[PDB]
Amino acid sequence: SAEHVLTMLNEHEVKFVDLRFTDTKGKEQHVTIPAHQVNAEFFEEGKMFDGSSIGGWKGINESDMVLMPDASTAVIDPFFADSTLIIRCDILEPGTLQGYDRDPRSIAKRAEDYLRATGIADTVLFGPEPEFFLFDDIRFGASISGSHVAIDDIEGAWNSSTKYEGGNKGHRPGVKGGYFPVPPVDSAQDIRSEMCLVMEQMGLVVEAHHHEVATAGQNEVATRFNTMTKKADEIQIYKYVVHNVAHRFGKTATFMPKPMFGDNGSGMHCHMSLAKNGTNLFSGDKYAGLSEQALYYIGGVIKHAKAINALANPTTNSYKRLVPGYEAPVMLAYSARNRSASIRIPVVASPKARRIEVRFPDPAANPYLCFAALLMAGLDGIKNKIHPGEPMDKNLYDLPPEEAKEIPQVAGSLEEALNALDLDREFLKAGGVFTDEAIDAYIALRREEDDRVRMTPHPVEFELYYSV
Amino acid sequence: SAEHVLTMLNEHEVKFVDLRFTDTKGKEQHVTIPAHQVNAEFFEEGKMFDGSSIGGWKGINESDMVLMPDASTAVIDPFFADSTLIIRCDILEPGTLQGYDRDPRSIAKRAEDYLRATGIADTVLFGPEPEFFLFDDIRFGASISGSHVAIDDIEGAWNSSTKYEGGNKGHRPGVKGGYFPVPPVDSAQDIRSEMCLVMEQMGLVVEAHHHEVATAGQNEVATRFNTMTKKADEIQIYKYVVHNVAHRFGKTATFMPKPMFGDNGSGMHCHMSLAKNGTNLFSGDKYAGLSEQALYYIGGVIKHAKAINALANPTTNSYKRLVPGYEAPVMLAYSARNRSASIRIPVVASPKARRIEVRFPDPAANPYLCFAALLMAGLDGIKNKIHPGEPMDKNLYDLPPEEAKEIPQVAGSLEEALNALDLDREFLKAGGVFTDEAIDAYIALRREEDDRVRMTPHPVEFELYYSV
Amino acid sequence: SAEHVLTMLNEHEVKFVDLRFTDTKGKEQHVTIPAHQVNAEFFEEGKMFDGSSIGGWKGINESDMVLMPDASTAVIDPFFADSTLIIRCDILEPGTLQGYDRDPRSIAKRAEDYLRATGIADTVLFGPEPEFFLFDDIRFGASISGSHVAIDDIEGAWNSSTKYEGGNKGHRPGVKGGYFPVPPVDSAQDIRSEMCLVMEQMGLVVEAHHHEVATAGQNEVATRFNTMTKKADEIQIYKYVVHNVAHRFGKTATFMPKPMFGDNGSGMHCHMSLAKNGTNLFSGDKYAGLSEQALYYIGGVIKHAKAINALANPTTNSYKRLVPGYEAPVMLAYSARNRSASIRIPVVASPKARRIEVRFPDPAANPYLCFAALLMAGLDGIKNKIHPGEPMDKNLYDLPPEEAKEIPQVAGSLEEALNALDLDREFLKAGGVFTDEAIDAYIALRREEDDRVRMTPHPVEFELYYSV
Ligand SMILES: Nc1ncnc2c1ncn2[C@@H]1O[C@H](COP(=O)(O)OP(=O)(O)O)[C@@H](O)[C@H]1O
Ligand SMILES: Nc1ncnc2c1ncn2[C@@H]1O[C@H](COP(=O)(O)OP(=O)(O)O)[C@@H](O)[C@H]1O
Ligand SMILES: Nc1ncnc2c1ncn2[C@@H]1O[C@H](COP(=O)(O)OP(=O)(O)O)[C@@H](O)[C@H]1O
Ligand SMILES: CP(=O)(O)CC[C@H](N)C(=O)O
Ligand SMILES: CP(=O)(O)CC[C@H](N)C(=O)O
Ligand SMILES: CP(=O)(O)CC[C@H](N)C(=O)O
Ligand SMILES: [Mn+2]
Ligand SMILES: [Mn+2]
Ligand SMILES: [Mn+2]
Ligand SMILES: [Mn+2]
Ligand SMILES: [Mn+2]
Ligand SMILES: [Mn+2]
C-alpha cells in the first residue's frame, strides 16, 4: 500500500511513523520518523540504520542494514499520544537488498516461498493460542549475596490472608481455580475486552477471550488464524496490545512460560493445516478425518521435535512448564482423544476445518522462527513420507511406566533443545531458508542465557543443601 | 429467541456475548465471544470447548463438550464496561447433542420433563429465599503453622469500640439485632435497592428487600417464584447481581451458610407447589388447606431428607448452621404453626397460593441439583403414597427430650448427607434424571472438600486441647 | 574398646551416650541413651530402632534395624551441657547382623575389605580438604508467588557501604580477596583456632588453618589423612565441630559447594595413595615420581568420573561450582604443573609422601560413598591396566579450543552424573560393595532433589525472560 499509506497519513493527521521489526530473540523493535520523512523513495529504498547493538546481528564492522517498509502492514498506534502510524519493516542487506540472513521475518517469508516452490501446497495456516498472566507487582534480582523473585496480583490465592487499605474483598481464584468463574472472582472482563477491541482495531480478528486455569491473573485471547507470516506479525501485535493495555490498566503482563510453580504454565499451542487452491490438504479418510499429508507433517514434527524446541521453547523457563499435571504435554504423540499427547487432532464436523494442534510451543518463542521450524519439519516429513506411527488413545501422565513407556519426548532442557537444533539442522537449511550462521548465531545467544541460569545459585539449593 | 437475539445485538450495539453455564458445585462459569462470532449455525450447533479443567467433568481425554446457547436466556450485563450480551448455555454431548450427564442444568430439565411424563403435574414451582451477608473486609488462610479467618463490616457489633478515621458514628445492629432497624442502624437501603433495580432489569421480579437478623450486614432480597428450571437460572443471576453490586459499592458479599458463629446463619428456604392446567394441585381440605398430593410430597421430602441434604447443604459449613436457636430447623416435620419444623406450611387466604416451604436448604446449594432433588423426592413420595404422619404443633428447640424425642432429622454432617445420597440414590436415578457417575462424581468432589476441613486443625482445638 | 568405654564413663561422670550414624545423603544422625542403658550386651547386640523415617532406608514394613556401637569411635561431646559420650554406630541387619546394604559406613568398610582381598594393597589413604563459609545471616524460601536467598556476613564485600549500629569498621575481603589478609581483614582467627583445638580434642589431627579466597567468610581447616573409613568418620566430626563452633560464635556455617556466584565455590579435594606393609605403592620412576600403580588408579578415576560425580558432587549446586575461573577443575586430566587439571600430582621430596589429588569432589558429598567410589574406580583402573594417557602440561581454562579441545570432563549436570552412575555401575558392585538397590535408592533420592530445582522457576529467568 505505498499509495494507501500516503492517503492514510492525511486521513489521520499522522505526525509520526513508527518503524517496527523483530530481533532474533523475538522482541519487537521500533524507530520513529516524522511523517514528513516519508516520501516516494522511502518506500523503494527504505532507510539506513546500524544493527550492531542488536542481539546477534552484531557485526560492529559490516552490519549497517536497511529497514524496508512493508506498505501493507500500516496501522495506527492506539496508545501513543501524538497520532502515529506503525509500519512493519523487513531487514534487507545493503545494496544487494534481498533480505538479511538473520532477519526472522525474512526467514519466515523464505519458508513460505519454499512451500509453494515444492508445490506441496500454496499457503500455510497458523492459529496460535498464546496464554499470559496479569500481575500488579513483579520484583526480582540477582547479586552476589543472593537473588529473588516476587509475584503479586490481586487475584493471587495467597492474598486470601492479606490486609488491604480499604479491606480485603476476598473473591480470588484458587490454585488452578482460574477457569471461567464469573466475576468478581475473575477480575478481568473489562481488561480482556479492551485488549480485544484494540487488537481488532489493529487488524487482528478475535474469536474469543476468557480467564485461564492459574490463579493470579492467567488469561488468554483467542485470535483467528492466518497465513504463517502474517500470523507471526499478528502475534507481535497481540503481545504489544496485551503488554500495553495491561500497562494502561495499572497491570503488568508477562508472556513468560512458567512464572509460578504449582499452577497448569502459559503456553502457545499451534494449530496448523496446509492448503492449495482453496482446498484443505489436511482432510482425508485416515485417522480422525485426516489426510495422508497431515500424518507425514505430524511425523516430521515429531522427528524434529527437539530441534523445533529450540525455537518454540527458547527459554530455560520453557522447560519448567513442560512437566506432567499442568496441561503441558511432553509426549511426542498424536491423538484426537488422549490429551497427554503433544499433538492433538481437533475433531470437527466439516473437512474445511481439519488440522493439527502442536501443543508444546510456548509464548516466549520467536513467532517467525518457531512457525518456520514447525512448517519445515512438516514439509520434510512429507517429502520423506515419515510415518507418525499409531495414535495414542491410552492413559494420561503417569500410568505409562507399566512397560516403562519410553516413547519420543520433547527436549528435557534448553541445552538439549539447542544441541539438537545444532545437529538436526538439516531440514531447516533446505530451500536456503535457514543458513548456518543464522542458526549458529541463535544457538550462541541462547547459550549465554542458559549459562546465566545454569551458573547462578538457585534459592531452592539453599533449602535443599545449606545444611549439608 | 434466535431471531430476538439478533435484533437485540443491533438494538444495544452489543460488542460481546458472554456465554454462561453452571458447574457441578454450582459456580456459574462464563466465556466471551465477540458479537460478530454470533451467526446462524452458532445457534443450532453451539460452540466447542474443553471441560477438562472443570470440577468433576474431568476427562482429560474425552470431555470436549458443546456450549449450547439458549436464545431465551439473553440479557445485557449491567456491570461490564463494553456493551455485552449474556446467554446461558447448556452443556451438550458432542455429536449426540442431547445433554451432558453431569450438566446440572440438563439434569434440572430432565427432572422437569419427568414431571410431565408421570402426568402427576405439568409444572413445578420454586420460590427460594436466599439470604447473604455484606462485609467490608474478609481475610483467611491456612498454612502448616496455623490458620485463620477475620470478618469485618461497618455493621459489626464488635466495632462499637473501634476507632475510626473520621470518628466512630456508632449505629450498629447488635447480635441478632439486624432486623428491620431503620437506618442508620441499617447501613444498606440504597445498596439493596440497587440489587433490586438491577435484578429486575435482568429479568427477575422483586417482591421485596430488607435487612436480616444477624449483625455485620446480613440481608435478603425476596424474588418471585418461577418454573423450577427458570428459577435456578434466576438464582445464579441473583447471586451475580448481589456479588457484583456489592463489589461496586466497595463491599464483598458471601452466600456461605454460617460465616459467623453466635448469630440466626444465612439460609435458602424453598417454597414449592405443583400445578396442572392453571390449577394448584397443592390445595385441598386436609391440614392447613393442603391437598392429599402435597402431603405425599412432604412425606417424600422427609424420607429422602439426608440425601437431599447433600445437594441443598453441600458444605461442611452448611452443618454449622443447622443447629437450634438460630431460626435453622433440624426437625424433619411439618406444621403451619410450630417453627421448629423444617417444613413449614404457609397459611394463606386463597387456594391459589397454597404451597410448602422446606426451610433446611442453604445458599451454597447448586440451585439445579438442589431443586431437582427436592422435586424428585416429592414425586417419589406421591407415587409411593408416603404418609408424612402428623404435624408438629408442640414446643420449639429443646423442650422435646421429655420422652427424649428422636423424630427424623436432617443430616448431622456432610459425610453423612453424602453417604445417604450414596445409598438412597434410587429416587434420583428415576426417569434417568440422575445417573450413577453424575452422582458418584458429585460425591467425590465434596468428599475431597470435606477432607480438607476434617483434616486441618481447627483454632478451637487449641483453645480446648493445647494445654492437655 | 568395650572395656575402654566403660572406664571412660566413670572417668568423665558421663550422663548420656549419643549414638551417631550416617544416612544415605550423608547427614550424620544421632540418638541419646542414658549412660546406665549401656551394659554388656549393648555392645554385642546393639540397640533396636526403626529406620523407616530416614532417607531411602524406607521400608515402612521391614526396616527395623540395629545400631551397632563401635567401641573404638568413643569420644566426649564438647558442646553438650550434660557430660555425654558419642559413639559412632553401624547399621546392621536384624538377626543376620552382618551389615545393611544401604548403610554408607558398611559400604565403606566393604570397599576397604575388598582392597585387602584383591591383595592389591592393605590400606587406602584419604586426605580431604573440605572448605566452607561462615555467615552471620542466611535466609531463603520458595512459595508459589516467588523464591529467594539472602546471604550476609560481616566480611561480605557488599557491606563496604552498609550502615552499622556502632559504625562501619570497613576491613573486608574483596571478591576473591579472602586469601591470607592479616586481621582485621580476616575476622576469623580465633574462630578457626577453636575449631582446631576442638577437632583435636575429638581425635582429629590438625595440620593447619587459614582464611580462603572468597569474600564473606570462606575458610578451611586442613586435617591429617587417615585410613579411608576412619577419615570419612573424621569428616563428619569435622563438619560437626565446624557447624557447632560456628553456631556458638553466633555464626552459621555451610558446606554447600556454591553459595555465592562470582566468587573461587567451596570444594573438597581428595588426596589419595595406597599402601602395603608400610610401603607407599604410589611412588615409582614414572611421571613426577609416581608408580605404575598410581597411573592405573588415575586412569580408573578418569574412566568412572561421571559416575563418581554422583557421589562426590551429589547436588545440583555442585555443578554451579564446576566452572572455569574459580579454581574448580572440570578437565579430567592429570598433571603436577597445570592446575586446569582435576587430578593434580603433588610434587614432593621423599617417596614416602607421593600421592594423587582428585580435586573435583565437593563438601556436600557423602564421605563414605564418595571415598568408596574413588577407591573402587581406582582399583578397577589397576585390575584392567587402564592407561591415563599423557599428562596435561599446557594452558589453563579457555586457551584450549584452538583445536577445540574436547578431552574428557566431569559430569555437566546432576541428572548426567546420576544417569552415568546408573550405567557405569559395574565397578561399584564389584566385591559386593555396592548393591543394585543401594545404588538405585540413592539415584531415586537425588532424582527428587534434582526435580525440585529443575522444576522451580529461577529468579534469573525473570531477569532474562519476563519481558519476553
Ligand atoms: N486450517 C484451519 N481451519 C480452521 N481453523 C484453523 C485452521 N488452522 C488453524 N486454526 C485456529 O484454531 C484456533 C482457535 O480455537 P481455540 O478455541 O482457542 O482451541 P483450543 O480448545 O485447542 O485452545 C484459532 O487460532 C483458529 O483460527
Ligand atoms: N405456588 C406458589 N404460589 C404462590 N407463591 C409461591 C408459590 N410457590 C412458591 N412461592 C414463593 O413464596 C416466596 C415469597 O415470600 P417471603 O415473604 O420471602 O416468605 P417467608 O416469610 O417464609 O421468608 C416467593 O419466593 C414466592 O414467589
Ligand atoms: N599418602 C599420603 N602421604 C602423605 N600425606 C597424604 C597422603 N594421602 C593423603 N595426604 C594429605 O594431604 C593433605 C594436606 O595438605 P594441604 O596443605 O591442605 O594441600 P593443597 O595445597 O592441595 O590444599 C592432608 O589431608 C594430608 O594428610
Ligand atoms: C488448552 P489449555 O487451556 O487447557 C492450557 C495449556 C497450558 N496453559 C500450557 O501450558 O500449554
Ligand atoms: C425465615 P427467617 O428470616 O426467620 C431466617 C432463616 C435463617 N436465616 C436460616 O438460616 O435459615
Ligand atoms: C586449592 P584452592 O585453595 O586454591 C581452592 C579450591 C576451590 N575452593 C574449589 O572449589 O575446589
Ligand atoms: Mn487455553
Ligand atoms: Mn489449545
Ligand atoms: Mn429471611
Ligand atoms: Mn422463609
Ligand atoms: Mn583450599
Ligand atoms: Mn588442594
Q: How far apart are CA B463 and CA B453, in angstroms?
A: 18
Closest C-alpha to ligand 1, atom 12: A127
State which amino acid sits at residue B51.
G
Taking an 8 Å cut-off on Cβ atoms, the answer to whether A179 and B54 are in contact is yes
Instruction: Give the DSSP H or E segment for B10.
Output: helix B2-11
| A265 Cβ below 6 A of ligand 4 | yes
Nearest residue in A to C454, CA atom: A320
Taking an 8 Å cut-off on Cβ atoms, the answer to whether A468 and C216 are in contact is no
Facing C317 at nearest CB: one of A138, A452, A465: A465
Q: How far apart are CA A242 and CA A255, in angstroms?
A: 9
For residue A131, report the phi and psi dihedrals to the nearest 5 degrees: -90, 160
Nearest to A149 by CA among A242, A246, A256: A256
Bond from prior residue into A184 cis (ω within 30 degrees of 0): yes
Q: How far apart are CA A111 and CA A98, in angstroms?
A: 15
| B50 Cβ below 6 A of ligand 1 | yes
For C2, the grid coordinates are 568395650
Domains in chain A, please, with CATH?
A: 1-103 (3.10.20.70), 104-456 (3.30.590.10)
* Residue C131 a catalytic site member: yes
Q: How far apart are CA B4 and CA B458, in angstroms?
A: 54
Q: A225 CB contacts (<8 Å, ≥6 apart)?
A: A125, A126, A127, A231, A271
Taking an 8 Å cut-off on Cβ atoms, the answer to whether B15 and A168 are in contact is no
State which amino acid sits at residue C314.
P
Contact C431, C442 (CB under 8 A): no
- Judged by DSSP in three states, B85 sits in strand
Q: How far apart are CA A85 and CA A76, in angstroms?
A: 4
For residue A327, report the distance from its CA to the centre of ligand 4, in Å: 5
Contact C126, C270 (CB under 8 A): yes
Q: B406 CB contacts (<8 Å, ≥6 apart)?
A: none
Nearest residue in A to C366, CA atom: A468
- Point out the ligand nearest to the CA of residue B283: 2
- DSSP letter, residue B181: P
Q: How far apart are CA A294 and CA A117, in angstroms?
A: 19
Beta bridge partners of A269: A129
Facing C142 at nearest CB: one of A158, A463, A468: A463
Ion ligand 7, residue ranges at CB < 5 A: A 220
Active site residues of A: 50, 129, 131, 212, 220, 269, 339, 357, 359
Nearest residue in C to A24, CA atom: C468
Bond from prior residue into B184 cis (ω within 30 degrees of 0): yes
For residue A91, report the phi and psi dihedrals to the nearest 5 degrees: -100, 110
For residue B247, report the distance from its CA to the centre of ligand 9, in Å: 22
- Judged by DSSP in three states, B274 sits in strand
Nearest to C79 by CA among C203, C254, C242: C242
Q: Cβ atoms within 10 A of the Cβ of C402, count? A: 8
Cα B143 to the center of its chain, rounded Å? 30
Question: How much of chain A is in helix, strand and coil states, percent to nearest 5?
Answer: 35, 25, 45
| B220 Cβ below 6 A of ligand 2 | no
- Kindly list the partner chains of chain C, i.e. chains with 3 or more CB atom pairs below 8 Å: A
- Which residue in the block uniquely carries the three cell numbers 475473575? A186
Nearest to C342 by CA among C408, C251, C438, C440: C408
For B445, the grid coordinates are 468432589
Beta bridge partners of B206: B223
User: Annotated binding site of B for Mn(2+), which residues?
Assistant: 129, 131, 212, 220, 269, 357
Taking an 8 Å cut-off on Cβ atoms, the answer to whether C463 and A175 are in contact is no
Report in angstroms the alpha-carbon separations of B283 from B245, B286, B344.
Answer: 39, 9, 15
Q: B33 CB contacts (<8 Å, ≥6 apart)?
A: A207, A208, B16, B17, B18, B19, B47
Contact B276, B121 (CB under 8 A): yes
Mutate to test the interface with A, among C366, C461, C463 (most CBs of A within 10 A): C461
Question: How much of chain C is in helix, strand and coil states, percent to nearest 5?
Answer: 35, 20, 45
**Ligand 4, pocket-test mutation among A212, A271, A322, most atoms within 8 A of CB:** A212
- Judged by DSSP in three states, C360 sits in coil
Q: Cβ atoms within 10 A of the Cβ of A96, count? A: 9
- DSSP letter, residue A457: P
- Judged by DSSP in three states, C222 sits in strand
Query: Resolution in angstroms, to 1 decimal, for this deposition?
Result: 2.9
- Judged by DSSP in three states, A394 sits in coil
Q: How far apart are CA C135 and CA C440, in angstroms?
A: 36
Q: How far apart are CA B25 and CA A140, in angstroms?
A: 38
For A61, the grid coordinates are 564492522
Radius of gyration for the alpha carbons in chain A, expressed in angstroms and rounded? 23
Q: How far apart are CA A45 and CA A41, in angstroms?
A: 6
Taking an 8 Å cut-off on Cβ atoms, the answer to whether C256 and A466 are in contact is yes
Q: B358 CB contacts (<8 Å, ≥6 apart)?
A: B269, B270, B272, B301, B342, B343, B374
For residue C268, report the distance from its CA to the centre of ligand 3, in Å: 12
- What does the CA dihedral C241, C242, C244, C247 come to, rounded to 10 degrees? 160
Nearest residue in A to C367, CA atom: A468
Contact A319, A410 (CB under 8 A): no
For residue A237, report the distance from its CA to the centre of ligand 1, in Å: 18
For residue B327, report the distance from its CA to the centre of ligand 5, in Å: 5
**Chains A and C: how many Cβ contacts under 8 Å?**
205
Q: How far apart are CA A358 and CA A370, in angstroms?
A: 12
Closest C-alpha to ligand 6, atom 9: C267
Q: Cβ atoms within 10 A of the Cβ of A408, count? A: 14
For A272-295, the DSSP string reads EEEEETTEETTB-SSGGGB-HHHH
For C370, the grid coordinates are 564418595
Nearest to A239 by CA among A25, A50, A56, A17: A25
A interface with B, Cβ–Cβ below 8 Å: 160-164, 166-171, 176, 179-184, 186, 189-190, 192-194, 196-197, 200, 206-210, 213, 264, 327, 337-340, 347-349, 396
Instruction: Give the DSSP H or E segment for A254.
Output: strand A252-254
- Per DSSP (E only), the strands in C347-448 are 356-358
